[PDB]
Design a protein around this ligand. Structure first.
Ligand code: FES
Length: 106
């Protein structure tokens, strides 16, 4: 599945990710800048935060309380598009998924 990461400045990064990996791993293992992922996908750091493109928000699983509580700590969270990428599992249906990276991670 192809996953597209776009930095806050418009720089586009494309990666191919096997179903089963998380979007965070897809970015981390392929050298995409803008994602720190300090806690390693344990949903406890909010440094894997990204804005899902509106065209894809409804195609993703609903966020769990534990995730939303963490997003509150993220840098400039967006109520409609913000997600923790380590909580998004890649599947063939997400082929073409577009994710916008924030200016900074906290
Ligand atoms: S990598 Fe820490 S919450 Fe996603």
């Amino acid at each position: 599945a192809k996953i597209i990461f776009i930095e806050h400045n418009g720089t586009r990064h494309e990666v191919e990710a096997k179903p089963g990996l998380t979007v965070m791993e897809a970015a981390r293992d392929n050298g995409v800048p803008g994602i720190d992922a300090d806690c390693g996908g344990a949903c406890a750091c909010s440094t894997c935060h990204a804005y899902v493109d509106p065209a894809w928000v409804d195609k993703l699983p609903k966020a769990l309380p534990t995730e939303t509580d963490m997003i509150d700590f993220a840098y400039e969270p967006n109520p409609a598009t913000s997600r923790l990428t380590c909580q998004i599992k890649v599947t063939s249906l997400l082929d073409g998924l577009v994710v916008h990276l924030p200016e900074k991670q906290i």
